[PDB]
């Protein structure tokens, strides 16, 4: 019930919708075009339709949905591929057979006829349960067990519990009554993208995001449930860091979110993920897709879907965190999302602000980024998850002055700063140590000292060495290495060794594909301790340089060792090398 009255491009006016609500999604026309309500002036409505509105007919029916832009969560959310508006691309392609996306597809987000193995918890048929209680878990696939949380805003004494067995989402797995009225819940939960997910308490982040790369792990650490920023426009560093996060990061899940980038780039990345495979610490070999969800909205996709992809991804990440899993979101191109928002604002004729973006761009970006953090779960049993966002930025020409870049730098705690200059100089990590920073180091210092009380001092010494590296750089630039003192020469040599041996990774090489934090800490110790032990001896720089050739080779090889030997063997080898270097530095003095 409801018919269109005026169709001016994307904007659509439909009469007979007195009961419509603002921002309620609606189905327009026989083709089931999907659009969101904007203005409810009079008894009429106003809808902007995402897909092309060409060919609409006056008095074509309009069908309400009684729900805002929402995502159907539950089993089967992992692995698949979804559009910006939560449209399963893979199943759409299989059903329609052809390649083109049909104008008005109506495939449900998750297949409601597929069977998943279900088994309840030890709860009783007449017990009491509340919102967020974990009443069952499902083996969606191997090694990615999926907990079934009773939806929030739903509570009451238990009435029926489905016994363990094979079931589908259409089955009524749960039914309960709060008052005399009883409600039955399936395995599918719908939640609006704009509304965040209910939380019990925002904890303080207390565990680093071990990305497997030494430069990010030690120099500029990032904590679970913490924002991150990447100036990714070239050098494939964004692809490299995304692959590292998918394969080696501590997160139990990853939710890539791609909006408004080049279509072939998304093709390349979405073909790269299935090829990516990660080995289990127990020796098992798995596929990253078994723990990966992908929301990719190319430029050809409607602008509104491009804007909504980010919120869809963050809501998916929050739902994953609802069962205490550590999940990491990855916004492919926030600049593209901002451009989509700008286009939408221009469609709405909103008053332009700085550089043309709407005045709420900073506010909306902050609202999105504020959802990341380590959070106590809702409902029992007690557990705690985390959501960390590693959303990248694409400043125009590298000038960190655009409002998107400025707002992101103002909100994001940790900025890693990939540099194209290092990429030109053949640097695999490509992380510019001169601009990167980790504002969460003060909070992470508790764990840093618990693991090793000397590690934080080593990090401070390394930061001082990096600061003096540029000083020695202009010193050599203006007068040369001749004017450098023995201590200055030792400091410069140690800085160069740190840059070319530990601060840089080798990625492609099997020995340096993954850098454990243990190996990173031992390498940092074997570098800094040797640097000091050589420093206080000032001894002729040439003499120590000649007599430390074996020590220099050991320091260089302190990163060539493969992780095959494991932590106990590599730690012992690094300790022996450090002791030998200390003996050589002290005895020869």
């Amino acid at each position: 019930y409801g018919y269109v009255r005026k169709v001016s491009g994307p904007v659509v006016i439909a009469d007979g919708m007195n009961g419509a609500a603002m921002y309620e999604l609606v189905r327009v026309g026989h083709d089931n075009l999907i659009g969101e309500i904007i203005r409810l002036e009079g008894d009429s409505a106003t809808i902007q339709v995402y897909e092309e509105t060409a060919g609409l007919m006056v008095n074509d029916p309009v069908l309400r949905t009684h729900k805002p832009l929402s995502v159907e969560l539950g089993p089967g959310i992992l692995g698949n591929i979804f559009d910006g508006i939560q449209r399963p691309l893979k199943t759409i392609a299989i059903r329609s057979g052809d390649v083109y996306i049909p104008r008005g597809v109506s495939v449900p987000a998750l297949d409601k006829d597929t069977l998943w193995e279900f088994q309840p918890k030890k709860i009783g048929e007449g017990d009491l349960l509340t919102g967020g209680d974990l009443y069952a878990t499902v083996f969606e696939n191997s090694l990615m067990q999926h907990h079934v949380a009773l939806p929030p805003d739903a509570m009451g004494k238990v009435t029926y519990v489905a016994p363990a067995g094979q079931y589908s989402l259409k089955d009524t797995v749960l039914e309960l009554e709060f008052q005399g009225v009883k409600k039955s819940f399936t395995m599918l939960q719908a939640w609006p993208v704009r509304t965040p997910r209910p939380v019990s308490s925002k904890l303080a982040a207390d565990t680093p995001l071990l990305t497997g790369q030494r430069v990010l792990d030690a120099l500029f650490p990032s904590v679970l449930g913490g924002t991150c920023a990447i100036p990714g426009a070239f050098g494939c560093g964004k692809t490299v860091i995304s692959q590292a996060l998918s394969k080696y990061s501590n997160s139990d899940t990853v939710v890539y979110v791609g909006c408004g980038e080049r279509g072939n780039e998304m093709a390349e990345v979405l073909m790269d993920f299935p090829q990516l495979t990660m080995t289990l610490p127990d020796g098992r070999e798995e596929s990253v897709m078994k723990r990966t969800t992908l929301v990719a909205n190319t430029s050809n996709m409607p602008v509104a879907a491009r804007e909504a992809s980010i919120y869809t991804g963050i809501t998916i990440a929050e739902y994953f965190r609802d069962m205490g899993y550590n999940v990491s979101m990855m916004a492919d191109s926030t600049s593209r999302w901002a451009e989509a928002l700008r286009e939408i604002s221009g469609r709405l004729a909103e008053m332009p602000a700085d550089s043309g973006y709407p005045a709420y761009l900073a506010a909306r970006l902050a609202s999105f980024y504020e959802r990341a953090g380590k959070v106590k779960c809702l409902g029992g049993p007690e557990r705690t998850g985390s959501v960390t966002i590693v959303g990248a930025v694409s400043p125009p020409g590298g000038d960190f002055s655009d409002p998107v870049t400025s707002a992101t730098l103002s909100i994001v705690q940790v900025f890693w700063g990939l540099d194209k200059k290092l990429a030109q100089r053949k640097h695999f990590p490509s992380v510019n140590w001169l601009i990167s920073y980790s504002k969460y180091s003060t909070a992470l210092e508790s764990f840093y000292e618990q693991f090793d009380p000397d590690f934080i001092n080593i990090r401070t010494k390394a930061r001082e060495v990096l600061q003096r590296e540029d000083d020695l750089n202009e010193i050599v630039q203006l007068v040369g290495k001749d004017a450098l003192a023995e201590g200055d020469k030792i400091t410069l040599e140690t800085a160069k060794l740190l840059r070319e041996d530990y601060l840089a990774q080798n990625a492609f090489t099997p020995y340096d594909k993954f850098c454990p934090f243990y190996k990173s800490v031992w390498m940092m110790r074997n570098i800094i301790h040797f640097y000091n032990l050589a420093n206080q001896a000032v001894i002729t720089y040439t003499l120590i340089k000649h007599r430390l050739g074996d020590l220099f080779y050991r320091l260089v090889s302190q990163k060539f060792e493969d992780p095959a030997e494991g932590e106990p063997a590599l730690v012992a080898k690094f300790k022996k090398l450090h002791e030998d270097l200390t003996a050589g530095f002290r005895a020869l003095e």
Binding site: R39, A359, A363, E370, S406
Partner: protein, 463 residues
């Protein structure tokens, strides 16, 4: 007394667009009347009636227009402007943006309902600030000091430790003591702060043990953008009640005033108002006045409201509309330099652009020393000459610094090294710091000093 009336509940909502909710057939509306909107789902949110024309009403809802149905939502007209239930018991508590008690405590039992945006003080009855303040930081007190009733903000770009400086000032705040009941009560507005910053503020304030005399008006970035505009209003109204109507001096603090500017810009762009510079509303000067222009001392009352805002230059540019208008209104600046932060100085206060327009009255003979003004002027003026010498050395060479310029360069170096730097918890007294300030001024010869007379500092004696 005039008989009471129950507020009319309407259901004639006949239009929603942006953040503005239209109504029709309103029987006797009132401008700026607070209306709480109950949606069809039953959830309730507040709102103000912006424009009143004929029998219509253009309401601006607070929690957002989402979920409003043109045939199921109900609007109730309370018939009174927004009022904050201020009370003396409100001390030592935490409130939301609109004032909801969020410390797991019972709501405020109001001693009196007071309307926000209170009327101005008759400037005939207005007085002048005449007492210094012991914040606990050296460089602010020694030069460009703060008077008990003076407004002055902190200019500090994003990422700088200005939040830590504000927390240290609030925890170490106190009178000169040259009393506890009338001692500094701190109203701590927090417009658009991050969650981590919010937890930091709560923990730091609870740790110093001065919860008994500090009120937090926290408003996170998650809260609605319009609700951030009323947070400074509520904070300043509570400050007005505490100071003028109860006596104790209030040291009002508002963090991230740029967030308030952004909220104003968003609200104005929503209603499509005439834009000033950088798309900001054309009345931003008046709004920043209604926020700032309340610090001062009233003649008949012993209270005093001291204002210490904290702005943030967006592009680290002083010419941005928000800091420019503030400097027009705020009677002085205390400036924080990113360049000094690059030198690893904990309180990165740059003194070259930092001046207190009321310092000429804070100084005198009742407090401080008789050489305060001249020493401050010299350490303010010779810094510029040292900077010029540094620029000349950069553009010519080390040989350009003559027997005079090299003295200015050494003065600048020692001034940035010893004088400005201070401990994270150092309560450096004025005289002990003024001795080192005199030493810095004496690095230059005691006869080349042009502006200062020799006798002024000669009255004071070393050791």
């Amino acid at each position: 007394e005039g008989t009471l009336e129950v507020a009319m509940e309407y259901r004639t909502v006949t239009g929603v667009a942006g953040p503005l909710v239209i109504l029709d057939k309103v029987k006797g509306p009132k401008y700026y009347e607070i209306v709480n909107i109950r949606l069809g789902d039953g959830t309730m949110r507040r709102g103000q009636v912006l424009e009143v024309d004929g029998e219509k009403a253009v309401v601006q809802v607070f929690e957002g227009t989402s979920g409003i149905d043109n045939k199921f939502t109900t609007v109730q007209f309370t018939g009174e402007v927004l009022k904050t239930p201020v009370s003396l018991d409100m001390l030592g508590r935490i409130f939301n943006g609109s004032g909801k008690p969020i410390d797991n405590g019972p709501p405020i039992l109001p001693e009196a309902y007071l309307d926000i945006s209170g009327s101005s003080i008759n400037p005939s009855e207005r007085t002048y600030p005449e007492e210094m303040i012991q914040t606990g930081i050296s460089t602010i007190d020694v030069m460009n000091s703060i008077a008990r009733g003076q407004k002055i903000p902190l200019f500090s770009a994003a990422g700088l430790p200005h939040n830590e400086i504000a927390a240290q000032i609030c925890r170490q705040a106190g009178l000169v003591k040259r009393g506890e009941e009338d001692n500094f009560a701190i109203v701590f507005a927090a417009m658009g702060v991050n969650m981590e910053t919010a937890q930091f503020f709560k923990r730091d304030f609870e740790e110093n043990g001065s919860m008994e005399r500090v009120t937090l008006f926290l408003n996170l970035a998650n809260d609605p953008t319009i609700e951030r505009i009323i947070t400074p209003r509520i904070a300043l109204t509570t400050a007005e009640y505490l100071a003028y109507e109860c006596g104790k001096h209030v040291l009002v603090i508002l963090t991230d005033m740029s967030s308030y500017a952004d909220a104003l810009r968003e609200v104005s762009a929503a209603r499509e108002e005439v834009p000033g510079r950088r798309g900001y509303p054309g009345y931003m000067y008046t709004d920043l006045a209604q926020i700032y222009e309340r610090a001062g001392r009233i003649e008949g009352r012993k209270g005093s409201i001291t204002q210490i805002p904290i702005l943030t230059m967006p592009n680290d540019d002083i010419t941005h509309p928000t800091p420019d208008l503030t400097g027009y209104i705020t009677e002085g600046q205390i400036y924080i330099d990113r360049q000094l932060q690059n030198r690893q100085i904990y309180p990165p206060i740059n003194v070259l652009p930092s001046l207190s327009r009321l310092m000429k009255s804070a100084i005198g003979e009742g407090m401080t020393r008789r050489d305060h003004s001249d020493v401050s002027n010299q350490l303010y003026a010779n810094y510029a000459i040292g900077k010029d010498v540094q620029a000349m050395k950069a553009v010519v060479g080390e040989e350009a610094l003559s027997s005079e310029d090299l003295l200015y360069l050494e003065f600048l170096d020692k001034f940035e090294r010893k004088f400005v730097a201070q401990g994270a918890y150092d309560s450096r007294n004025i005289f002990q710091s003024l001795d080192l300030a005199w030493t810095l001024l004496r690095i230059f010869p005691r006869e080349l000093l042009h502006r200062i007379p020799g006798k002024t500092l000669d009255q004071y004696y070393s050791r």
